[PDB]
Design an enzyme around this catalytic site. Sequence first.
Site, short mmCIF file in Angstrom:
data_model
loop_
_atom_site.label_atom_id
_atom_site.label_comp_id
_atom_site.label_asym_id
_atom_site.label_seq_id
_atom_site.Cartn_x
_atom_site.Cartn_y
_atom_site.Cartn_z
N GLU A 39 39.96 54.67 45.08
CA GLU A 39 39.38 53.33 44.96
C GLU A 39 37.85 53.34 45.01
OE1 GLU A 39 40.73 50.62 44.12
OE2 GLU A 39 42.88 50.95 44.49
N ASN A 84 35.91 42.41 38.39
CA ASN A 84 37.18 42.30 37.67
C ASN A 84 37.00 41.33 36.49
OD1 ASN A 84 38.62 42.12 40.95
ND2 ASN A 84 38.60 43.93 39.64
N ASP A 100 38.65 38.70 35.68
CA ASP A 100 38.79 37.30 36.04
C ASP A 100 37.58 36.75 36.79
OD1 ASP A 100 39.09 38.44 38.52
OD2 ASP A 100 41.05 37.52 38.96
N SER A 140 36.48 37.88 39.76
CA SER A 140 36.50 38.32 41.13
C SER A 140 35.86 39.71 41.23
CB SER A 140 37.93 38.33 41.67
OG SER A 140 38.72 39.27 40.96
N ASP A 196 35.82 43.45 43.73
CA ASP A 196 36.41 44.33 44.73
C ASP A 196 35.31 44.92 45.60
OD1 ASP A 196 38.95 43.86 43.75
OD2 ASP A 196 39.09 45.74 42.63
N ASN A 252 39.87 42.61 47.19
CA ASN A 252 39.56 41.63 46.14
C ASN A 252 39.11 40.30 46.73
OD1 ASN A 252 39.53 40.14 43.72
ND2 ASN A 252 41.39 41.12 42.95
N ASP A 300 52.05 42.10 53.31
CA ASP A 300 52.34 40.85 52.61
C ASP A 300 53.52 40.95 51.66
OD1 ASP A 300 51.67 42.02 50.19
OD2 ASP A 300 49.91 40.75 49.86
#
Length: 129
Positions: free
Chosen positions: A35, A46, A48, A50, A52, A59, A101
């Site tokens: 990562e 990203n 969209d 957003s 990281d 995110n 989650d």
Amino acid sequence: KVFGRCELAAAMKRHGLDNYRGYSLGNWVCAAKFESNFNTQATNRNTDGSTDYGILQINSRWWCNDGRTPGSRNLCNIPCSALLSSDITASVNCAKKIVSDGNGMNAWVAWRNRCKGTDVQAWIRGCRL
Ligand SMILES: [Cl-]
Ligand SMILES: [Cl-]
Ligand code: NA
Ligand code: NA
């Protein structure tokens, strides 16, 4: 900060990630390598809009607030800049919420594509833990 492999493994163990939700330590080290290349300062945009952040590339769509991701959540209740610290506490505490989650470590694309199903113990081989 750019961590060494065994330095990061020891820090992540100190913070309770070894076997957290059944994921052995090597899984977390492998995810961090691909990562962020072990760099706490890493950021990546990203498509969209957003971003990281940090060693585990958390995110801003769901997990932290960066002030520029409209309609997003802040489920870890932290500014995204806290995830860039040389102290990995905030990143680890938020990762524990993510991995719990329902989707486990599949939330991290690089883990699924480059660590899952490989000999992840190799990532902690040789380290004094
Ligand atoms: Cl730390
Ligand atoms: Cl799981
Ligand atoms: Na392991
Ligand atoms: Na957000």
